[PDB]
């Protein structure tokens, strides 16, 4: 049996209004007796969830407390403690808004010289680099319209072999039709990150 605690997601933080945060206890073929206790009390009340029958003999059980959008931003340490329908000693976790930061450095880079000559589809790339917790959000823009997530591909954050400061990196690709590029309209990549002061930061592209 193990307990893990899950932070609010920048997705729900920035583009939304309902950070949940999730304390989930994992495995032990239990009736899910459980019981969860949380830090900021009273304000909003905590909610348990279905024993989402985790593969094998885990049957994991989860918790959320809605509305914790403001206490995340004022740092404030969050605790979760669960004492479970088995034995031994209850389990507990805790997180908070990460200390050290490091703003992303964002770079939107051009189609291949050898690919754009063959006027068909070509590749826009977006590079988030050297930042704080691995969690980021990259959204592409045509003109000034958010493209549906399904039109562009984004890889996940992974630690880069860094000299000292452990920093992350992310890339994204938007494949587009050449006539749009040679025509002259505008594309952008935008990266939202916990550190960054204005939340997201935009950097654009022309040719």
């Amino acid at each position: 049996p193990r307990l893990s605690l899950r932070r609010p997601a920048l997705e729900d933080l920035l583009l939304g209004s309902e950070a949940n945060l999730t304390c989930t206890l994992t495995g032990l073929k239990d009736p899910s007796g459980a019981t969860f206790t949380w830090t900021p009390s009273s304000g909003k009340n905590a909610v348990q969830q279905s024993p989402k029958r985790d593969p094998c003999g885990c049957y994991s059980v989860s918790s959320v407390l809605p509305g914790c959008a403001e206490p995340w931003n004022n740092r404030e340490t969050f605790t979760c403690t669960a004492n479970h329908p088995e034995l031994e000693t209850p389990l507990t976790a805790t997180i908070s808004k990460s200390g050290n930061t490091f703003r992303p450095e964002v770079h939107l880079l051009p189609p291949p010289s050898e690919e754009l000559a063959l006027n068909e589809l070509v590749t826009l790339t977006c590079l988030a680099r050297g930042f704080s917790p691995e969690d980021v959000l990259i959204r592409w823009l045509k003109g000034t319209e958010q493209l549906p997530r399904d039109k562009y591909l984004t890889w996940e954050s992974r630690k880069e072999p860094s000299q000292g400061t452990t920093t992350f990196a992310v890339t994204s690709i938007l494949r587009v039709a050449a006539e749009d590029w040679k025509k002259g309209d505008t594309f952008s990549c935008m990266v939202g990150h916990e550190a960054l002061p204005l939340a997201f930061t935009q950097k654009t592209i022309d040719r």
């Binding site: 920035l14 000034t144 952008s188 204005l198």
Partner: protein, 190 residues
Amino acid sequence: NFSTPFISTRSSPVVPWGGSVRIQCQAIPDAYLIWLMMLKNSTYEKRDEKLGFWNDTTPEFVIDHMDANKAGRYRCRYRIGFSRFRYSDTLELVVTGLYGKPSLSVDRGPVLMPGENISVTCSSAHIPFDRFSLAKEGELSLPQHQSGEHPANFSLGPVDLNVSGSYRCYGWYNRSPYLWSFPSNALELV
């Protein structure tokens, strides 16, 4: 204190039901998220959502296929950082092409030199509109003149040429201030 950002409709803000216009807000460039609202029933609700910064222009919306649904109080919503929420002063939109064209007319000739007065009489004989509004072309706002007496007595006083061009007139009821009649006959004042 502050002003709060502006709300404009770069094309005249009244459109035939199914019409298209180029609505525009001001651009707080420290606000990534911008939300066009329609203050609908006690509250306000998201219609369009344009994300990003504007270190250049100002943000425009576009309402196409203008509905009875799409008429009312429109307001911009700016989100700065993680808690700053700045609004915008309100704008309203109204549709045309709903009831039945009123008919308007003059007391003098169609090119009155304005040292002396011209009143227009606009009314409907078979559609008991609550009020009437006389709509000039071009000018980007809710009409300069509106009344609710059984003849539409709209004189112009001693006119002057920034009062010139094409004019029409629309009906209006009580609880459909957003829903107006068809466009009437045109007045080519010169």
